Design a binder for this molecule. Structure first.
Ligand SMILES: *[C@@H]1O[C@H](CO)[C@@H](O[C@@H]2O[C@H](CO)[C@@H](O[C@@H]3O[C@H](CO[C@H]4O[C@H](CO)[C@@H](O)[C@H](O)[C@@H]4O)[C@@H](O)[C@H](O[C@H]4O[C@H](CO)[C@@H](O)[C@H](O)[C@@H]4O)[C@@H]3O)[C@H](O)[C@H]2NC(C)=O)[C@H](O)[C@H]1NC(C)=O
Ligand SMILES: *[C@@H]1O[C@H](CO)[C@@H](O[C@@H]2O[C@H](CO)[C@@H](O[C@@H]3O[C@H](CO[C@H]4O[C@H](CO)[C@@H](O)[C@H](O)[C@@H]4O)[C@@H](O)[C@H](O[C@H]4O[C@H](CO)[C@@H](O)[C@H](O)[C@@H]4O)[C@@H]3O)[C@H](O)[C@H]2NC(C)=O)[C@H](O)[C@H]1NC(C)=O
Ligand SMILES: *[C@@H]1O[C@H](CO)[C@@H](O[C@@H]2O[C@H](CO)[C@@H](O[C@@H]3O[C@H](CO)[C@@H](O)[C@H](O)[C@@H]3O)[C@H](O)[C@H]2NC(C)=O)[C@H](O)[C@H]1NC(C)=O
Ligand SMILES: *[C@@H]1O[C@H](CO)[C@@H](O[C@@H]2O[C@H](CO)[C@@H](O[C@@H]3O[C@H](CO)[C@@H](O)[C@H](O)[C@@H]3O)[C@H](O)[C@H]2NC(C)=O)[C@H](O)[C@H]1NC(C)=O
Ligand SMILES: *[C@@H]1O[C@H](CO)[C@@H](O[C@@H]2O[C@H](CO)[C@@H](O)[C@H](O)[C@H]2NC(C)=O)[C@H](O)[C@H]1NC(C)=O
Ligand SMILES: *[C@@H]1O[C@H](CO)[C@@H](O[C@@H]2O[C@H](CO)[C@@H](O)[C@H](O)[C@H]2NC(C)=O)[C@H](O)[C@H]1NC(C)=O
Ligand SMILES: CC(=O)N[C@@H]1[C@@H](O)[C@H](O)[C@@H](CO)O[C@H]1O
Ligand SMILES: CC(=O)N[C@@H]1[C@@H](O)[C@H](O)[C@@H](CO)O[C@H]1O
Ligand SMILES: *[C@@H]1O[C@H](CO)[C@@H](O)[C@H](O)[C@H]1NC(C)=O
Ligand SMILES: *[C@@H]1O[C@H](CO)[C@@H](O)[C@H](O)[C@H]1NC(C)=O
Lengths: 419, 419
């Protein structure tokens, strides 16, 4: 197609929970709150937000923790955009129960437009996607929800791509699909119109200038019902990175189940499981898996992880290591619900970078909405090296433990560890 | 199609090595030597044998063990059929090296016809199939080679189906394929003629009278190049039994590798591996795997077995147990090469019976020749119950050990056990 001449600059943003300290103070990345506040300050034309839920203040959480100031500050700034003329459009998954939306109603009276999307009817899933589009020039893609706990209590990772007009405009078309479906009584068309179609797929990714160095990038979405003809499915993009890896594969995802969860009877789903086994056996690829464990983790997830870590010995010449990332929690942090977990969902190889917003279960690629960014770059350094250094910081950390560790040793209440 | 009115009677024959004693003397099945000698005594019209190799006497083994008398007796009887007018046709895989054939030349001068089939060129494999066809009325299908060690030193299992003219004639067409390929300069046709075509596939198995009770049976062969249009591939038949099981799956096979062995680079082959994982997860099927370990077992096979036995806990509600069958060997038995192993290759479910002649690796269904018999029967009892009782005798035996057993404990030299 046509190349993008915009001076695209990519910044890796992550939120470090209070109490998590890394002695190797060498990465130094901006926090999600700092990036969000900077994005809101420079917004003057439009702002498109796709979110799972809105719990940006202490009222919805029904708590009195003083760590919600950063979350409240974002909400305070969001209420000032509409008066200045910024077209704020928010797509939020419709809650299952009758939960009041104090934050969304606050923005509704300010002048924003909020639309609830019934994923449970259209695709029998939810809207797990999380991204921003500011002025169609800068976009944020990551795992951070609209929580005050997502900025100070949980550990996350996202990417803010500045001054990339061509790439942000591609993300808008994904948001246009949710905006169209948010309309009451609107069903999924058999074929999407050209408006939502894209020409930058896996086969022909777009060419950008990431910090000067040329690179190839393309966006992959889910579920298929919503993907137009030119959009690469998220599972296909995920498997392509695993198939093309030749040296190593680094995966840090909160949950990994090779099963269609919720759907009963238990459906087996060996899509990503087979890709990892092929990589380590057929090729000399070393695979490192970093999974997050907390009180609400599925206990069935351990059996499928022990079945994967078993394939590592001299005879088979395979190398799979599985480690659990447990965020320590004291009594004060334990009182906050859904507050101490590692939320990062991304994959790093020796040649490609994958950053997604959906877990690695079966429903997140067939029923649940989601979006992932795939950037490849020639030569050493760049975004891939920065992301690789983050993974190694987590891997060689006191908060990452093996699968045979006693559950008392870790700071939190891990359900995947025996005794 | 048309049903078979022949009074088909099926007998399970197995060879028990010297020194192997089962206190539960309740099965009582005839030995392979007894069945073979009875088959040869009643042969008057024809005899078709498909074999891997011929080592029926002490000369080829270059040993002086007195346990080869049974093997020599079979060879002595085989030399008398041709004088009586029996048309003896033998298909034997061509040896890789220049190994002399003392047994085959002995039969050649008697009047038999011996043809060597170059599987290493036609399908880049070997002729691992093992079956007999006596007078086109009685056929033996099993794992027993033409060894004197296959009758007294190794443990095997086969089925002799008496008075089944319709079923034996179906097995002849498989032998006709090897006979056609045994001709020098004969290549695999693109489409087999009608002569080798069959009408009793998995979709429409033939109806027989197994000991009076009606039953459905069909033969499955390999590799596909040799399977005509109407012949069910062996892998498809094997996977159908696993897919249709609802209560339990009992598997006793010498080697189980989800990889295309020999073929390099290491090719992954999760065909049967995925079927077993689906059965235990999606359904409440209990899977029991009995693998044979000896000095020549592939050490890489342990990692793929530990990766399968890991999927068994309350949370996942799965039940996979893997055990190793080790035939004890003293100093005298150790001196005999390739002499102390469990050679049985069969699968038992709650509704179907599978008896095959090929291991469960990747090459035995794509390159290597092989044949399997699939018999299903309504109601309790019959062949399936007899085969199930054999498996439980092996499972609850002192010669079957778990994967964590020390390698010194077992009587033989097992390469799959640590320390
Ligand atoms: C492509 O181009 C983009 C745009 O320039 C680059 O993005 C920059 O990345 C660098 C490095 O990650 C960023 O610099 C770092 O910022 C961190 C966070 O900034 C805040 O830090 C404190 C936190 O309280 C605030 O007080 C402060 O005002 C900032 O708002 C800093 O913490 C980092 O400093 C720490 O780490 C370094 C080592 O990394 C130590 O040497 C320091 O002493 C200190 O401990 C650091 O300054 C920069 O902010 C990003 N730019 C933007 C606009 O966000 C991409 O990195 C680039 N791509 C590549 C591959 O180079
Ligand atoms: C469908 O129809 C066929 C045809 O009849 C049946 O096949 C018969 O199966 C039975 C049971 O397996 C066979 O009977 C058994 O034979 C064993 C081996 O026979 C030899 O045994 C000794 C070994 O040295 C020789 O001396 C002897 O002369 C035989 O040549 C015996 O060992 C068995 O006896 C032992 O076990 C039983 C318990 O099983 C004990 O009670 C005994 O005391 C003893 O310990 C037994 O006699 C029979 O031979 C088979 N027939 C043929 C023609 O081979 C199928 O079983 C049938 N299908 C079903 C489902 O019933
Ligand atoms: C995305 O593109 C915009 C547009 O170029 C970038 O903004 C520009 O950033 C530079 C760097 O700070 C600014 O230069 C500075 O100007 C001040 C005077 O205002 C001067 O004192 C400094 O020494 C420096 O030269 C530039 O003014 C600014 N332009 C605009 C219109 O804001 C922006 O930085 C880019 N995004 C990222 C993440 O870099
Ligand atoms: C396969 O079919 C043949 C043909 O029927 C079976 O052979 C028959 O077996 C019966 C049972 O032993 C024989 O009956 C016996 O006859 C003798 C006299 O010879 C008698 O003294 C016995 O009391 C008994 O009645 C029958 O003669 C025999 N027929 C032939 C032609 O051999 C054979 O048994 C069947 N196969 C199997 C495994 O059963
Ligand atoms: C694969 O082989 C390597 C090299 O032998 C093993 O690495 C060392 O092995 C020796 C003995 O085999 C141990 O004493 C060392 O502790 C091992 N070092 C490390 C860093 O592991 C390795 O253990 C073997 N197995 C695997 C799964 O790599
Ligand atoms: C699955 O649950 C069953 C029932 O609780 C377990 O069976 C017994 O479990 C208790 C405690 O959980 C043990 O003390 C017994 O020794 C178990 N009996 C047997 C025969 O195992 C069973 O262990 C659990 N796990 C699996 C894989 O079945
Ligand atoms: C929903 C809610 O609690 N609203 C309170 C209101 O009751 C109180 O009067 C006011 C002054 O503090 O602050 C706000
Ligand atoms: C190949 C071989 O050893 N053949 C032997 C022969 O040498 C010997 O003369 C004969 C008498 O025992 O027995 C046979
Ligand atoms: C809820 O919001 C109100 C006003 O926005 C304020 O009182 C406070 O921030 C929250 N808590 C309570 C108890 O009202
Ligand atoms: C080989 O066969 C011959 C004759 O068949 C006989 O001597 C014996 O059975 C075997 N062994 C030796 C040493 O010849």
């Amino acid at each position: 197609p046509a190349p993008c001449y915009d001076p695209c600059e990519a910044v890796l943003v992550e939120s470090i929970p209070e109490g998590l300290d890394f002695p190797n103070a060498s990465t130094g990345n901006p926090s999600t709150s700092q990036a969000w506040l900077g994005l809101l300050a420079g917004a003057h034309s439009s702002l498109d937000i796709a979110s799972f839920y809105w719990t940006l203040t202490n009222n919805d959480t029904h708590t009195q923790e003083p760590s919600a100031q950063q979350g409240e500050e974002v909400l305070r700034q969001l209420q000032t955009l509409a008066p200045k003329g910024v077209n704020v459009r928010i797509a939020v998954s419709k809650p299952s129960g009758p939960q009041p939306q104090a934050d969304l109603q606050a923005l509704l009276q300010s002048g924003a437009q909020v639309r609830m999307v019934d994923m449970q009817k259209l695709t029998h899933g939810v809207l797990h996607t999380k991204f921003w589009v500011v002025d169609q020039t800068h976009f944020y893609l990551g795992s951070a929800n609209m929580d005050w706990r997502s900025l100070t209590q949980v550990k996350e990772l996202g990417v803010v791509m500045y001054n990339c007009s061509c790439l942000a405009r591609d993300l808008t078309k994904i948001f246009e699909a949710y905006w169209f479906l948010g309309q009451a009584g609107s069903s999924i068309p058999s074929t999407w119109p050209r408006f939502y179609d894209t020409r930058y797929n896996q086969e022909t990714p777009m060419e950008i200038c990431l910090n000067g160095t040329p690179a190839l990038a393309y966006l992959a979405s889910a579920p298929p019902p919503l993907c137009p003809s030119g959009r690469t499915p998220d599972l296909k993009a995920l498997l392509n990175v695993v198939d093309n890896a030749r040296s190593f594969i680094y995966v840090a995802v909160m949950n990994y189940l090779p099963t269609l969860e919720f759907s009963h009877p238990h459906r087996f789903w060996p899509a990503i499981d087979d890709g990892l086994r092929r990589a380590t056996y057929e090729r000399g690829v070393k695979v490192r898996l970093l999974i997050s464990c907390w009180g609400h983790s599925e206990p069935s997830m351990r059996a499928f992880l022990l079945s994967l870590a078993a394939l590592r010995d001299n005879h088979t010449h395979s190398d799979i290591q599985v480690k659990l990332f447990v965020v320590p929690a004291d009594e004060a942090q334990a009182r906050i619900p859904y507050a101490r977990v590692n939320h990062n969902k991304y994959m790093v190889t020796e040649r490609a970078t994958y950053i997604g917003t959906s877990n690695w279960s079966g429903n997140y690629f067939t029923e649940t909405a989601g979006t992932s960014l795939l950037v490849t770059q020639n030569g050493r350094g760049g975004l891939r090296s920065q992301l690789e250094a983050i993974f190694l910081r987590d891997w060689d950390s006191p908060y990452s433990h093996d699968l045979d560790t006693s559950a008392d040793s870790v700071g939190n209440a891990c359900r995947l560890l025996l005794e």
